C-alpha cells in the first residue's frame, strides 16, 4: 500500500462548533436543462450542428 501522510502528532483534534441555523440560507438553484446546467457531454461520440 502507500501512506498519504505521516500520522498526526496532535494530542487532540481541534474544537468544532456546529450551528445549523447560521449555515441554513434560502438560495433556490433549480438545474436548467435549457441552460444545459450539470449536463454531461456524450463521451461516446462528438457531434456537429445536427
Amino acid at each position: 500500500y502507500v501512506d498519504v501522510g505521516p500520522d498526526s502528532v496532535k494530542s487532540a483534534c481541534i474544537e468544532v462548533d456546529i450551528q445549523q441555523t447560521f449555515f441554513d440560507k434560502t438560495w433556490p438553484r433549480p438545474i436548467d436543462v435549457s441552460k444545459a446546467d450539470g449536463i454531461i457531454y456524450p463521451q461516446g461520440r462528438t457531434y456537429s450542428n445536427i
Partner: antibody, heavy 128, light 110 residues
Framework: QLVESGGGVVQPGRSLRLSCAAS????????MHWVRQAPGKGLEWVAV????????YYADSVKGRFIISRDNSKNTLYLQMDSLRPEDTAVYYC???????????????????????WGQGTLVTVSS | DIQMTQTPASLSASVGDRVTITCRAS??????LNWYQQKPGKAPKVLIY???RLQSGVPSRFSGSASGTDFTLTISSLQPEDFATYYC???????????FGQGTKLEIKR
C-alpha cells in the same frame, strides 16, 4: 456534580461495587471518570473512561482488577473491584477529565477544561 | 521505565519566605505538565496546566517554570494557610499511565 456511593468496609478478594452519579450534568457531553489517594502515598489515579465508554484506562497498581461501565442515560458510572488487599484500601474520587485543544494560527488557544464538581471521594477499607 | 523524585520530601519555610519546590521526571515526554496542590478533606486543585500558562483561579505568587527534565515551582509571601502538600503530574495522551506527585509537605518555621 459527581458523587460516589456504595463505599464501605469490604472483605478481601470480594467484588466491590462503586457508583458515581453526575447531577444536573450531561454525561454524554464530557468524558466522566475517576482518580485515587491512599495515606502515606502521593495523589495517584484510578480509572478514566471516554464519554462513549469504548476507551478504558486503569490505574497501574491494579492489573485490570477495576472494571468501569457507564450509561449516559443512567448518568451513573459503575466500578467493580476484585482481589481487594490492605494496600489497595484507599479513598476513590471520580471527576470528569478535559484537555485544551486549539491551533495557534495567531497565538490562539482555548482552555476547554471542566474539572469543576470534582468528586468528594468515598473510603473503602479492607479489614476483618 | 519512568522515575519521578522531589528534591525535598518535606520543606520547612517561615511566613513571608521565598522558596522553590522542584519535581524531576525521568524525561519531559510531553509539553503539558500540571502541578496540583492538595488540602486534606478537599479536592485537588491544579496550580498550572502546561507550566507556560497559569491555571484560572490560582494566585500569581505560584509560578511554574520547567528547565530541563526537572520542573521548578516558585512561591512568595508564604502563609500558614497557604502551606500544603504539592504534587506534580506529567500528562501524555499516548501513555495511559499518569505520573504521581511525591507530595512535598510545607510547614511553618519558628
Amino acid at each position: 456534580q459527581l458523587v460516589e456511593s456504595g463505599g464501605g468496609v469490604v472483605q478481601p478478594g470480594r467484588s466491590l461495587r462503586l457508583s458515581c452519579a453526575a447531577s444536573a450534568f450531561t454525561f454524554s457531553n464530557y468524558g466522566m471518570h475517576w482518580v485515587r489517594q491512599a495515606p502515606g502515598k502521593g495523589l495517584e489515579w484510578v480509572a478514566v473512561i471516554w464519554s462513549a465508554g469504548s476507551l478504558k484506562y486503569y490505574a497501574d497498581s491494579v492489573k485490570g482488577r477495576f472494571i468501569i461501565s457507564r450509561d449516559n442515560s443512567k448518568n451513573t458510572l459503575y466500578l467493580q473491584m476484585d482481589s481487594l488487599r490492605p494496600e489497595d484500601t484507599a479513598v476513590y474520587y471520580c471527576a470528569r477529565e478535559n484537555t485544551t485543544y486549539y491551533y495557534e494560527t495567531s497565538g490562539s488557544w482555548g482552555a476547554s477544561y471542566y474539572f469543576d464538581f470534582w468528586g468528594q471521594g468515598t473510603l473503602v477499607t479492607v479489614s476483618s | 521505565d519512568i522515575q519521578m523524585t522531589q528534591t525535598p520530601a518535606s520543606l520547612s519555610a517561615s511566613v513571608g519566605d521565598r522558596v522553590t519546590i522542584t519535581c524531576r521526571a525521568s524525561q519531559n515526554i510531553s509539553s503539558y505538565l500540571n502541578w496540583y496542590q492538595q488540602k486534606p478533606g478537599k479536592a485537588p486543585k491544579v496550580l498550572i496546566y502546561d507550566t507556560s500558562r497559569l491555571q484560572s483561579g490560582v494566585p500569581s505568587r505560584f509560578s511554574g517554570s520547567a528547565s530541563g527534565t526537572d520542573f521548578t515551582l516558585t512561591i512568595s509571601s508564604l502563609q500558614p494557610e497557604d502551606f500544603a502538600t504539592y504534587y506534580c503530574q506529567q500528562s501524555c495522551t499516548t501513555l495511559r499511565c499518569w505520573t504521581f506527585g511525591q507530595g512535598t509537605k510545607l510547614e511553618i518555621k519558628r
